[PDB]
Amino acid sequence: GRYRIRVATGAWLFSGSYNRVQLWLVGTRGEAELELQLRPARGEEEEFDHDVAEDLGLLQFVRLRKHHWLVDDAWFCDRITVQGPGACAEVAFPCYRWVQGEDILSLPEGTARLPGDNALDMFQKHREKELKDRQQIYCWATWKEGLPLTIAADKRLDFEWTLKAGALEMALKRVYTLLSSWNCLEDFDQIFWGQKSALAEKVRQCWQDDELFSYQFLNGANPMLLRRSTSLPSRLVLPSGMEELQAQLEKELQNGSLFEADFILLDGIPANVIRGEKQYLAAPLVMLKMEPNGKLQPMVIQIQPPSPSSPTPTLFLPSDPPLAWLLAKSWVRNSDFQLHEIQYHLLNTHLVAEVIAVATMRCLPGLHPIFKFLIPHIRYTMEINTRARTQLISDGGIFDKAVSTGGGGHVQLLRRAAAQLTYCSLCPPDDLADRGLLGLPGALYAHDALRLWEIIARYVEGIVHLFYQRDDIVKGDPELQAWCREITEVGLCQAQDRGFPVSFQSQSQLCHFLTMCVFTCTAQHAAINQGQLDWYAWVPNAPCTMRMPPPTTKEDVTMATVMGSLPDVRQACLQMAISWHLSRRQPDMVPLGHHKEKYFSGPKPKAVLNQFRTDLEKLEKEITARNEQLDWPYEYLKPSCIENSVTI
């Protein structure tokens, strides 16, 4: 028989000209040792023809052993397609990994399989051995107690914070030295350098108007906090002489047009000590009304919650001294930065995707269809999360030197956010319905996220119904239930009380969970991550820290109070530096659904992926056609802008 082996190689660090790899073509009945002289080249899927004597039959495995290689040499094998005798289709053998060590690497058949009761099966023994190895090379590690577990620590964020921190402090000190005329609001202009978008310049022009401030809770960088008020909040205590606000609040409550954004998760979080001076934090509540034209308007801001020391806090109105109102809006924006960069971007998207990634690597073998479905969406997640825990959110890290929740309070905020990290909150048809953002016309994030949920759910159902045709197939899959408990009981630290499933009992439960996983890894991260390029490039639109306590009297708020509460040159330039470094477009960006890795080998999972791409193209056309009529477009959930995994 004539076997045609096409080797697709991702990357290679071959020191020599040619390297020899032994390639056993393991089939049902017999195997065939072949020697391959690897001469890779970019975009060259090296073909090798071989004439065998024995009949291997249907191929099942491909075994690779790097015969007498160099120590430094490395080879990332993408896939091995073997065309057997006759016109038989090119059987694919997904590798997509660094072939490392002198041990024999076994690549099974690319058709995805579920485990069975036959322990003497070749794919069953292979997936058991692969799971035993991948539970050894992927280990859970607790970073902080009460937080979800991480991967064990044993180019877009690749630096050293200890080496760069002193030079960054000297650079910020020289900016402080050559620029010390800071008294007015426009003085953030001379540090406003970079690739500012049209939306970023529109934020610069129009951040002070109340409708942009209200627009940020719906379609800003953090659209995850605004909920429709079913009742007035218990922390909203109105003092005497403010019965007109009470009448307006009850009128907007009865009309269903009352909305709230409560930052109560930040109450009691100890603030950072940045360069000696103690920063300050608050837990505001902004009450907003939905005007009949479709635009939110702010009703009231309560910067601090009630306390035993202050039973009724100051309620700042949009019809107050304009600088007190500006400072109240800035405090809300600072707290939106705090709850955005910790709860909704770091916890709800990064740490959840890292838990999904580690559990997918640990409990789903390479043959499993859910692994092949999820491995494009978990790429570089543990790497970026480890770099974040090493540099961004470490002790004395980036957050300890830039952000007011840093220095220890961000860990407490992560604990409090993981306390309320619910499975309802990670699903937009559940989160937006719980928050009452369904049917809202101006809620462009909610509309795009619901449309993405429909498309991603179509993708998930299309993949799942090929391999799980009945509910008892979902129940009887032990690797799937192990992956489910590894997410819920182990990775998310017993999150079954937070709505996460302990086991899968139906097709639809698994479909909802996998839709949540793909939405968290791709769409929710895009919606929570693309906002810092334009909304957070202007430091007064979202301060990273506040250097003064929140105001208690409106008439004492001057420009000196606003400018003293707003960050100085070092904190603001550091915040813009981080926001510019994190939200820049990397050249290796893979859009959603457009991964070039062919893990599945059947034509029907590929057809499901093509329908996913077609629906995403239709959604991108719809969002683009919607956005021309809007002066404030929502481009954060365009599928071309949605990255295929949490990589930043």
Which partner in Fe ion, a copy of itself, none is near 178 (CB below 5 to 8 A by kind)?
Answer: a copy of itself
Burial of 279 by CB count in 10 Å (0-12 exposed, 13-18 middle, 19+ buried)?
Answer: buried
**Separation between Cα atoms, residue 494 and residue 502, nearest integer Å:** 9
Which partner in Fe ion, a copy of itself, none is near 181 (CB below 5 to 8 A by kind)?
Answer: a copy of itself
Binding mask 237-256 for Fe ion (x = CB under 5 A): --------------------
Shortest distance, CB of residue 405 to a copy of itself, whole angstroms?
20
At residue 644's C-alpha, the angle toward residues 639 and 645, to 5°, is: 135
H/E stretch holding 141 reads: strand 140-141
Helix, strand and coil content of the chain, in percent to the nearest 5, comes to 45, 15, 40
Shortest distance, CB of residue 560 to a copy of itself, whole angstroms?
13
Residues of the chain immediately before an interruption (C to N > 2.5 Å): 154
Shortest distance, CB of residue 528 to Fe ion, whole angstroms?
7
Q: How many other β-carbons are positioned within 10 Å of the β-carbon of residue 511?
A: 22
Shortest distance, CB of residue 441 to a copy of itself, whole angstroms?
36
**Residue 327 main-chain phi, psi, to 5 deg:** -70, -35
CB 285, CB 234: distance < 8 Å: no
Nearer to a copy of itself, 35 or 189 (CB): 189
Q: For Fe ion, how many residues bind (rule: CB under 5 A)?
A: 1
State the DSSP code for 324: H
CB 641, CB 379: distance < 8 Å: no
Q: Which range touches Fe ion (CB under 5 A), out of 185-193, 394-402, 414-422, 525-533?
A: 525-533
Does the footprint of Fe ion cover residue 529 (CB under 5 A)? yes
Cα dist. 95→25, 50, 434, 590 in Å? Answer: 14, 21, 42, 19
Does the footprint of Fe ion cover residue 583 (CB under 5 A)? no
Shortest distance, CB of residue 648 to Fe ion, whole angstroms?
5
Residue 282: name the closest of 309, 313, 249 by CA: 313
Shortest distance, CB of residue 98 to Fe ion, whole angstroms?
25
Nearer to Fe ion, 214 or 529 (CB): 529
User: For residue 524, which amino acid is it?
Assistant: Q
Nearer to a copy of itself, 193 or 209 (CB): 193
User: For residue 330, which amino acid is it?
Assistant: S
Residue 107: name the closest of 358, 370, 367, 375 by CA: 367
Distance of CA 409 to the CA centre of its chain: 22
Shortest distance, CB of residue 197 to a copy of itself, whole angstroms?
11
Q: Which residues bind a copy of itself (CB under 8 A)?
A: 155-156, 158-159, 164, 167-169, 171-176, 178-181, 183-184, 186, 190-191, 193-195, 573-574, 576-578, 580-581, 584, 587
Nearer to Fe ion, 412 or 529 (CB): 529
Shortest distance, CB of residue 281 to a copy of itself, whole angstroms?
25
**Separation between Cα atoms, residue 22 and residue 56, nearest integer Å:** 17
Q: At a CB cut-off of 8 Å and minimum separation 6, what does 120 contact?
A: none
Q: How many other β-carbons are positioned within 10 Å of the β-carbon of residue 375?
A: 21
Q: Which residues are annotated as a binding site?
A: 345, 350, 525, 529, 648
Which partner in Fe ion, a copy of itself, none is near 629 (CB below 5 to 8 A by kind)?
Answer: none
Nearer to Fe ion, 529 or 571 (CB): 529
Which partner in a copy of itself, Fe ion, none is near 16 (CB below 5 to 8 A by kind)?
Answer: none
Listing from the earlier edge strand, what are the strands of the sheet with 296-302? Answer: 227-228, 258-262, 285-290, 296-302, 315-316
Shortest distance, CB of residue 520 to Fe ion, whole angstroms?
11
Which partner in Fe ion, a copy of itself, none is near 150 (CB below 5 to 8 A by kind)?
Answer: none
Nearer to a copy of itself, 412 or 575 (CB): 575
**Distant-in-sequence contacts of 566-570, Cβ < 8 A, 24+ apart:** 566/188, 566/330, 566/539, 566/540, 567/539, 567/543, 568/176, 568/182, 569/172, 569/175, 569/176, 569/179, 569/180, 569/182, 569/191, 570/169, 570/172, 570/173, 570/175, 570/176, 570/275
Three-state SS at 435 = coil
Nearer to a copy of itself, 219 or 583 (CB): 583
Which partner in Fe ion, a copy of itself, none is near 318 (CB below 5 to 8 A by kind)?
Answer: none
Which partner in Fe ion, a copy of itself, none is near 529 (CB below 5 to 8 A by kind)?
Answer: Fe ion
Q: Which range touches Fe ion (CB under 5 A), out of 16-24, 510-518, 521-529, 625-633?
A: 521-529
Shortest distance, CB of residue 177 to a copy of itself, whole angstroms?
8
Shortest distance, CB of residue 621 to a copy of itself, whole angstroms?
28
Q: For the chain, what's the residue count?
A: 648
Helix pair angle (210-219, 322-339), 10° resolution:
10
Nearer to Fe ion, 354 or 461 (CB): 354
CB 579, CB 533: distance < 8 Å: yes
Does the footprint of Fe ion cover residue 601 (CB under 5 A)? no
At residue 571's C-alpha, the angle toward residues 568 and 576, to 5°, is: 115
Nearer to a copy of itself, 265 or 566 (CB): 566
Nearer to Fe ion, 106 or 524 (CB): 524
Tell me the residue nearest to Fe ion as measured from the CB. Answer: 529
Instruction: Name the one residue in this structure whose structure tokens are 């008892």.
Output: 472
Which partner in Fe ion, a copy of itself, none is near 581 (CB below 5 to 8 A by kind)?
Answer: a copy of itself
Does the footprint of Fe ion cover residue 385 (CB under 5 A)? no
Nearer to a copy of itself, 477 or 568 (CB): 568
Nearer to Fe ion, 216 or 529 (CB): 529
Binding mask 251-280 for Fe ion (x = CB under 5 A): ------------------------------
Which partner in Fe ion, a copy of itself, none is near 194 (CB below 5 to 8 A by kind)?
Answer: a copy of itself
Q: Which residues are annotated as a binding site for Fe cation?
A: 345, 350, 525, 529, 648
Shortest distance, CB of residue 531 to Fe ion, whole angstroms?
11
**Residue 613 main-chain phi, psi, to 5 deg:** -65, -40
Which partner in a copy of itself, Fe ion, none is near 577 (CB below 5 to 8 A by kind)?
Answer: a copy of itself
Nearer to a copy of itself, 172 or 283 (CB): 172
CB 585, CB 566: distance < 8 Å: no
Shortest distance, CB of residue 164 to a copy of itself, whole angstroms?
6
Burial of 195 by CB count in 10 Å (0-12 exposed, 13-18 middle, 19+ buried)?
Answer: exposed
Which partner in Fe ion, a copy of itself, none is near 195 (CB below 5 to 8 A by kind)?
Answer: a copy of itself
- Positions touching Fe ion (CB under 5 A) are 529
